[PDB]
Write a protein that binds this ligand. Structure first.
Ligand SMILES: CCOP(O)(=S)OCC
Ligand SMILES: CCOP(O)(=S)OCC
Ligand SMILES: [Fe+2]
Ligand SMILES: [Fe+2]
Lengths: 329, 329
């Protein structure tokens, strides 16, 4: 009681977040793209209706909150989010930060300037909205570019000032979390404020447990992503991998087994629109996982339960861990 | 009489364009940047006031029209343009196309899809505005990337369908215009519909005359850009060059001398806001050329006149050539 998190619809008690998906997207896009070329998505109205149907479905499966980790460079549209949230009756936490597609106007900025930009989105609001970010997203793909280091640092500085957490994109098989951790630690950020994302993209428990031992949250956030039985499509193969959802799901159990149940964050990394990819890739995705953001409660939790993970443990993972992570600290 | 060009304020007779700067910017930015972080520019209001003061000044010097060649990826804000145009009483033609900073949502698109995007901006309007583009901007920096080839082709296809002209960014010293020309010609575009930009960045008349002989318009569009007496600042040196404005201006005379007066387009490539660059670079620019978009009528035309270029020739360059270029053909 009495700790608050900013949502697209305004503030809520942390205790009201409930079953929370911590790495999600309404639309995966680019800044200004949705405004410029709505027809790409059929229409803006079509995209919203699809997101509402999707989020209604998640909600029926027990999801009460999602964190949309779309940054300015993922084409985050806070008005869209608010609209869909209201319609679906699902809370959405918005993000600041930057992903690996920053435009030059961002790439030319100093660490100080980036810090002011993240803070503005957190403390003041996004664009002219008044809608405040509840999280900061950052990214690497392998070893950090020099700009990427500035971003990670600005992210840490913003976090220290606000108590808002940081979440990351990684190339998991390259073990990016180790560098990201060092940089965050250099800025003095507590690891408990940090989630190392896409960690389910690897089965290297040495890497994962090492992070969890330091106190980092480990994001097992691409649960539905598999290219199996779609070995034809090269684009899909790179995007989705050859590991099954079950293989990915087992990692949650593996961590719990190693004593790290408190350090786990679980998600889909789903979206309802996808311009960042070739045009077919939305539909291919919907064929593979028609349950969308319902997948984790429908398929993952029962699988874990059948494997012996206790229901209270499952609750701690899906409710307590997000609540603790989100709570400005 | 009776040929029309689309402006941000609506259609105008071609004959009303008058003294026209064909390669300009209100703001050089990135998609959504101005919406997200207006404080970068002091405020949106500050940026507009500066643009109005600048364009008032140009107007007093005789400029009646400018073509803002800012694309979606240069952070073109058509509402801003309309506002400033109205206030300054200077016509602004808006652009479609893409520059060399396209986001992934664009980079993932097919040639067909790009063609539909350019056409939408031309035939329907930009964003939800109803404001139609009067020109298509495209770019290379050296030899074309494969995506850049698709863009050039989509640009040609849109042009053929509309009669709207194409203008380019080049790495002039690498002679990009020759490749760009070949691609446009492959798509069947007339060279008279095309301007090969930043051609004043080189003194290679062999390259320039070769283009002019084929019927291309040659854009001598960075007239005020010189780093001389600023040999300290490395950033400026790359951006502005070591050639004087006079050296750049002489090229106009050189072309006229070679019989190509009808093939010349003249400009500044100025802007009033600049996020695409490091933070100081706006102010450095304003110190060098306080006249802004007035520079060409103030300094360039008189220099040419003093060198013997006839006033009627100067008129043909600054009025007739733009009119002919802009007129949907
Ligand atoms: C395939 C989904 O990948 P991301 O989390 S990097 O974001 C793109 C929206
Ligand atoms: C220095 C001005 O360069 P550009 O024409 S490439 O556009 C940036 C606005
Ligand atoms: Fe994501
Ligand atoms: Fe330009």
């Amino acid at each position: 009681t009495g700790d608050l998190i900013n949502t697209v619809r305004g503030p809520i008690p942390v205790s009201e977040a409930g079953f929370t998906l911590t790495h999600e997207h309404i639309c995966g896009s680019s800044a200004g793209f949705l405004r410029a070329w709505p027809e790409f998505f059929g229409s803006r109205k079509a995209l919203a209706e699809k997101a509402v149907r999707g989020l209604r479905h998640a909600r029926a499966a027990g999801v009460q909150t999602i964190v949309d980790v779309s940054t300015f460079d993922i084409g985050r549209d806070v008005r869209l989010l608010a609209e869909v949230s209201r319609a679906a009756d699902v809370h959405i936490v918005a993000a600041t930060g930057l992903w690996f597609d920053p435009p030059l106007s961002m790439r030319m900025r100093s660490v100080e300037e980036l810090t002011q930009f993240f803070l503005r989105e957190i403390q003041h609001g996004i664009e002219d909205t008044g809608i405040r970010a509840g999280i900061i997203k950052v990214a690497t793909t392998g070893k950090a570019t020099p700009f990427q280091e500035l971003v990670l640092k600005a992210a840490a500085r913003a976090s220290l000032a606000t108590g808002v957490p940081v979440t990351t994109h990684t190339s998991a098989s390259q073990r990016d979390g180790e560098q990201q951790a060092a940089i965050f630690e250099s800025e003095g950020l507590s690891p408990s404020r940090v989630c190392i994302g896409h960690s389910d993209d690897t089965d290297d428990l040495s890497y994962l447990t090492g992070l969890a031992a330091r106190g980092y949250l480990v994001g097992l956030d691409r649960m539905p992503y598999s290219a199996i039985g779609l070995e034809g499509d090269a684009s899909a193969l790179a995007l989705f991998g050859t590991r099954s959802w079950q293989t990915r799901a087992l990692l949650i159990k593996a961590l719990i087994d190693r004593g790290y149940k408190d350090r786990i964050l679980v998600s889909h990394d789903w979206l309802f629109g996808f311009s960042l990819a070739v045009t077919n890739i939305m539909d291919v995705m919907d064929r593979i996982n028609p349950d969308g953001m319902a997948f984790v409660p429908l398929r993952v939790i029962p699988f874990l339960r059948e494997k012996g993970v206790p229901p209270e443990t499952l609750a701690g993972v899906t409710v307590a861990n997000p609540a603790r992570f989100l709570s400005p600290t």
